Design a protein around this nucleic acid. Structure first.
Ligand SMILES: [Ca+2]
Ligand SMILES: [Ca+2]
Length: 757
DNA sequence: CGGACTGCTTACC
DNA sequence: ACTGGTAAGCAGTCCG
């Protein structure tokens, strides 16, 4: 299997490395045969020498076009011949481009921003993570003596924990008499050991939890301030601290640094993303968090260091088990997208999509359109019509069928050949005119995106067939990841169309996909209500909830199945309606907010404060019970009673504080904020004390007793002390518990005043 | 000024 | 930073 690619500068020339593992051994295949390239379009072909006259001033010597050649390519299908200007070293590519472009002879520059290492893998047609090879992994984690708003590295590392299949051990420089602890002389000695342990083990993968933005950055500052060759790489290299927008990433050249945080953060929805949280969320088992006030008092005292050690070890053990679970599927994405596990795991859907296109575009001899200019991005800042959302028939209904189109937007993109290279073509024999947007789509040649989207779905069925066959549960797991990911990559293409930063941006394409969506869902609802006696209780983009009011469950089901048999043949191309749920009873509140309970008793909840992570657990828990009380059981009184108890408990300060915690994400740079919420207020106060409240940070806080602004009474959850200051029973009554409960109970002719204690 | 409007902000579907 | 459509609350805005 191939791990990743980079290049070293062997005596002026660049040498491409292909880090791999085959025959149970790690190899480094070098390659000096590859040369950088970049496409240019001149107005008059003859004057290629005049353009080649353009040199570029670089920090290291001078640079000029090593060679050139006319390449017969295509651009949005329409053939286009271009000058492919080669270069001696790739670092000269970004120097001589702003000049080579600006030149009045050259029309435009194309494919100038693709990294050399990644470019090689695209052209050679090599696929990271292929073929069954067992990769050894090693998890590691650190415990530091943190104080309030110190400089990052000022505190020394007390412990370093590591974990793998065989064991989990702790390296520290204070006497802790436990079998899994290794006591060194000093902090410098603890690290010097940890570095041996890695080397002696020689693992392919290094697993961390937020290792990119903390653990690796911290160890460097320590190793720097102590004078240590922090050499973790197989080539004996120090870790690279490369930047990635608001955050950084960390490269261990020779090994795969797998940081779980960006994966976990982008895969599971949780209020907090503490390692203690995700372990419970993924595995079910609990995990104790030994805090900094504890860690410090232990170090300073020497008293309870055995407890601080159990934490250090667990942190690693957990970190390893999370890695061993998530790494498999992230490896399948490495193969699918065509770039490294390192890149893939740190990338957005926009990038993973764009990397998929660049690869399939090369194979197809399609010249990749450039990322948008600062001016261009603002030129394409115009929103469009989205999905249809029917205003719900509010109330408590019985016997609901839920119908929805199988993969709507991708089915529309393939069926109507919605591509940027099929949009308003010159003299196609056959054309598809989109309903409201009016944009015509050519039907003579399969479009670039539709074609690939076709192949993806084509393959997803090949993989789901090989699954039913595959006897090995290990293969049946790895096959499932492949097809589950393909489906996500498939439904991502419409969004990539509407994405201003995207290479293959197409406002017309996006607007037309949604436009058809509306045509079809509305025509189903119309047929379902007219041709058949159904009442559509609710709908949203591609699905609907319906019933025959008086009818029984058996009848609803039959007549619903009858409808599919009727409608589906009248629908065009890949568009096909599906029966995907029956519910004994259902409760629709507002657009986006509703709950159902199936024949077997499982309540499904959508939109309501229960599922929202910016609501106190008591409000959510309260709503959840005052919702079960009306659905699972038909006792509207029970809900009245439940609400009346949860109020008095809050009134008599008997509700545990943990349940009163309110989580809100800080989205942008704190200074940029216009208006101040309670969660911004807390962030601005913590910023004065030098807490790292950066974009992506979650503000956990409790509202304290008083009056005026809710934000000026807001303190961090960590810093709540029952003895010192109490909580605001008025807030968690009037602003949380009562509202969420009244949403459900308002339909049963109850007032808010009624439910209070 | 004690109410109703309106804009900012977050997280959901 | 993959989209648009939507609920809902905080904390200011207007106005008689
Ligand atoms: Ca549903
Ligand atoms: Ca579906």
């Amino acid at each position: 299997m191939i791990l990743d690619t980079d290049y070293i500068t062997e005596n002026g020339k660049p040498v491409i490395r292909v880090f791999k593992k085959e025959n149970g051994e790690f190899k480094i295949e070098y390659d000096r045969t590859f040369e950088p390239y970049f496409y240019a379009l001149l107005k008059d072909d003859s004057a290629i020498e005049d353009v080649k006259k353009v040199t570029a001033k670089r920090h290291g010597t001078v640079v000029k076009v090593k060679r050139a050649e006319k390449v017969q390519k295509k651009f949005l299908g329409r053939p286009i011949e271009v000058w492919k200007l080669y270069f001696n070293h790739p670092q000269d590519v970004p120097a001589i481009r702003d000049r080579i472009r600006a030149h009045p002879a050259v029309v435009d520059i194309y494919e100038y921003d693709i990294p050399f290492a990644k470019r090689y893998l695209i052209d050679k047609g090599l696929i990271p993570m292929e073929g069954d090879e067992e990769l050894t992994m090693l998890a590691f984690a650190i415990a530091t003596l943190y104080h309030e708003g110190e400089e990052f590295g000022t505190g020394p590392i007390l412990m370093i924990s590591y974990a793998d299949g065989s064991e989990a051990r702790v390296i520290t420089w204070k006497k802790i008499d436990l079998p899994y602890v290794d006591v060194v002389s000093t902090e410098k000695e603890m690290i010097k050991r940890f570095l041996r342990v890695v080397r002696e083990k020689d693992p392919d993968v290094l697993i961390t939890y937020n290792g990119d933005n903390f653990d690796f950055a911290y160890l460097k500052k320590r190793c720097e301030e102590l004078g240590i060759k922090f050499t973790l790489g197989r080539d004996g290299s120090e870790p690279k601290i490369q930047r990635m927008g608001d955050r950084f990433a960390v490269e261990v050249k020779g090994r795969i640094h797998f940081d779980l945080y960006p994966v976990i953060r982008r895969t599971i929805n949780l209020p907090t993303y503490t390692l203690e949280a995700v372990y419970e969320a993924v595995f079910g088992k609990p995990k104790e968090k030994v805090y900094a006030e504890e860690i410090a008092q232990a170090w300073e005292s020497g008293e309870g260091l055995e407890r601080v050690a159990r934490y250090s070890m667990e942190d690693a053990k957990v970190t390893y088990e999370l890695g061993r679970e998530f790494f498999p599927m992230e490896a399948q994405l490495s193969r699918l997208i065509g770039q490294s596990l390192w890149d893939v795991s740190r990338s957005s859907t926009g990038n993973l999509v764009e990397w998929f296109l660049l690869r399939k575009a090369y194979k197809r001899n399609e010249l990749a359109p450039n990322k948008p200019d600062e001016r261009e991005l603002a030129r394409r800042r115009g929103g469009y019509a989205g999905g249809y959302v029917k205003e719900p028939e509010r109330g408590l209904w019985d016997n609901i069928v839920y119908l929805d189109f199988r993969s709507l937007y991708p089915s529309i993109i393939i069926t109507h050949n919605v591509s940027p290279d099929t949009l308003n073509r010159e003299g196609c024999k056959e054309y598809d005119v989109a309903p409201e947007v009016g944009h015509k789509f050519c039907k003579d040649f399969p479009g670039f995106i539709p074609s690939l989207l076709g192949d993806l779905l084509e393959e997803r069925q090949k993989i789901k067939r090989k699954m039913k066959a595959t006897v090995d549960p290990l293969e049946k797991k790895l096959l499932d990841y492949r097809q589950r990911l393909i489906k996500i990559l498939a439904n991502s293409f419409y969004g990539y169309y509407g994405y201003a930063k995207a290479r293959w941006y197409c406002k017309e394409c996006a607007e037309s996909v949604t436009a058809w969506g509306r045509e079809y869902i509305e025509m189903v609802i119309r047929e379902l209500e007219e041709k058949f006696g159904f009442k559509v209780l609710y709908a949203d983009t591609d699905g609907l909830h319906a019933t025959i009011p008086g009818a029984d469950a058996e009848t609803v089901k039959k007549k619903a199945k009858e409808f599919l048999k009727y409608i589906n043949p009248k629908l065009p191309g890949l568009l096909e309606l599906e029966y995907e749920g029956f519910y004994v009873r259902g409760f629709f509140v507002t657009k986006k907010k509703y709950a159902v309970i199936d024949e077997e008793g499982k309540i499904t909840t959508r939109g309501l404060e229960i599922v929202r992570r910016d609501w106190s657990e008591i409000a959510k828990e309260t709503q959840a019970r005052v919702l079960e009380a009306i659905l699972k059981h038909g006792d509207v009184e029970e809900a009245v009673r439940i609400v009346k108890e949860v109020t008095e408990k809050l009134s008599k300060y008997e509700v545990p504080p943990e349940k009163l915690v309110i989580h809100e994400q800080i989205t942008r740079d704190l200074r940029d904020y216009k208006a101040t919420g309670p969660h911004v207020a807390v962030a601005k106060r913590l910023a004065a004390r030098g807490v790292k409240i950066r974009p992506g940070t979650v503000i956990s806080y409790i509202v304290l007793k008083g009056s005026g602004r809710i934000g000026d009474r807001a303190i961090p959850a960590d810093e709540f002390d029952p003895t010192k200051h109490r909580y605001d029973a008025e807030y968690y009554i009037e602003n949380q518990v009562l509202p969420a409960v009244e949403r459900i109970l308002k339909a049963f002719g109850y007032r808010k005043e009624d439910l209070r204690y």
